[PDB]
């Protein structure tokens, strides 16, 4: 794509805090286009945030959700769009996209950046505890068993999970993380394997949470008894 | 603010079939309707702009129709790359507002889940909390109800679910439900059960364990 929009300035912030996003554009004459910010909360749809006029940007528009807290501006000499974000709240957590208005009379977006993630939370960096989801003692003879790992209570996203250092991929399902009421995340990863393998094959989940430098390998085995 | 209502929220079709997506608006927006496609992990892409205008470079199988209050995006014959989420956007007034999306997903034959329940590990219990996990593996269609029962009492408010994207090979979903209890609450009960309702199962399937069993 000849048109490029590159967002920066995102990241973690405490409730009540501020961030300034920037978007540097290339491939078109920036001063000739209206621009907008649009955001997408985790697992949700698109939501318009703000728009700014061309050329000078005298004229601006805001969603009620952000009015009075956020300010959109532009610097045409730098091909840059800004979003000043004040008094941030948890519900402002989202990927923020810089977007170009496709015509001289519409803010409907044609081109979008890749987005920048803004996470608003009071949680502290914390590595997960990793607990086995042990295969049932009643696993069907000659049939299929399930086992897994629960990766609990970490912040921030993301964690990665592999099985047997990446050698085991067939039958693996690693679920999207869930944000718990505590403000910490949890997710589970499972795999189905032959019941006949449970006594002899090793199953290890390899969990990596880079923000906390947590690296855990958990062998998941039938529970003794 | 103008409300955009997209339906159906999920459209289940096979490659080659015609897809019809609807967006109705709460007031007359003339012809200022726009349609976007979005794939997981990617930014949206504009398909059709105001006046049902097909964007340059977008394949001819995409077209928009309607004006006023009732708008349609048609994909004349679905290609594999077209399974994605689609959003409508009105650009008549500020605030600019979007529909909630329609997911175009791959239809396949009915597949019942395999179901597995997992007790909390001893190491977790040592920590003060108990998570009980129920897995529904490889099912289609997406609709699935998971009901937790503790000594036959229906639970509410203390579980969370997560679901995978459609599998690239077999077009099924998988789902986990996690029941979270304090250690003290966990230890004052005996039987933990997950009951699964899915149209592939002729009646609901329950998997259970008793505390203290191997």
């Amino acid at each position: 794509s000849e048109v490029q929009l590159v967002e920066s300035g995102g990241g973690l912030v405490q409730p009540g805090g501020s961030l300034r996003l920037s978007c540097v554009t290339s491939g078109f004459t920036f001063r000739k286009f209206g621009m907008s910010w649009v955001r997408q909360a985790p697992g949700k749809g698109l939501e318009w945030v703000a728009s700014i006029s061309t050329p000078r940007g005298s004229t601006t528009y805001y969603s009620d959700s952000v009015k009075g807290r956020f300010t959109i501006s532009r610097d045409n000499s730098k091909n840059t769009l800004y979003l000043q974000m004040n008094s941030l709240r948890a519900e402002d957590t989202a990927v923020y996209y810089c977007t170009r208005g496709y015509s001289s009379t519409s803010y409907a977006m044609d081109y979008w950046g890749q987005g920048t993630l803004v996470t608003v939370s009071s949680a502290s960096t914390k590595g997960p505890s990793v607990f086995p989801l042990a295969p049932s003692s009643k696993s069907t003879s000659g049939g299929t068993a399930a086992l897994g790992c629960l990766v609990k209570d970490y912040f921030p996203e993301p964690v990665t999970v592999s099985w047997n250092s990446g050698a085991l991929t067939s039958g693996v399902h690693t679920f999207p993380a869930v944000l718990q009421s505590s403000g910490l995340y949890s997710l589970s990863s499972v795999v189905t394997v032959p019941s006949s393998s449970l006594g002899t094959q090793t199953y290890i989940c390899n969990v990596n949470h880079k923000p906390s430098n947590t690296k855990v390998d958990k062998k998941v085995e039938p529970k003794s008894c | 603010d103008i409300v955009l209502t997209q339906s159906p929220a999920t459209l289940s079709l096979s490659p080659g079939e015609r897809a019809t997506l609807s967006c109705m608006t709460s007031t007359d927006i003339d012809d200022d309707m726009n349609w976007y496609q979005q794939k997981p992990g990617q930014a949206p892409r504009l398909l059709i702009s105001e006046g049902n205008t097909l964007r340059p470079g977008v394949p001819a199988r995409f077209s928009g129709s309607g004006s006023g209050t009732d708008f349609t995006l048609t994909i004349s014959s679905l290609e594999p790359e077209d399974f994605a989420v689609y959003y409508c956007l009105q650009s008549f007034n500020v605030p600019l507002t979007f529909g909630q999306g329609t997911k175009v997903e791959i239809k396949r034959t009915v597949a019942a889940p395999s179901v597995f329940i997992f007790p909390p590990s001893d190491s977790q219990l040592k920590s003060g909390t108990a998570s009980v996990v129920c897995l529904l593996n490889n099912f289609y269609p997406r609709e699935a109800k998971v009901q937790w029962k503790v000594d036959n009492a229906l639970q509410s408010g203390n579980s969370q679910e997560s679901v995978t994207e459609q599998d690239s090979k077999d077009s099924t979903y998988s789902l986990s439900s996690t029941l979270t209890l304090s250690k003290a609450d966990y230890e004052k009960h005996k039987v933990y059960a997950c009951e699964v309702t899915h149209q592939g199962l002729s009646s609901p399937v329950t998997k259970s364990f008793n505390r203290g069993e191997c």
């Binding site: 728009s51 006029s53 528009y61 208005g101 | 500020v94």
Partner: peptide, 9 residues
């Protein structure tokens, strides 16, 4: 007619 301006002057 819409309630916003994109190109000013």
């Amino acid at each position: 007619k819409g309630n916003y301006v994109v190109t000013t002057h």
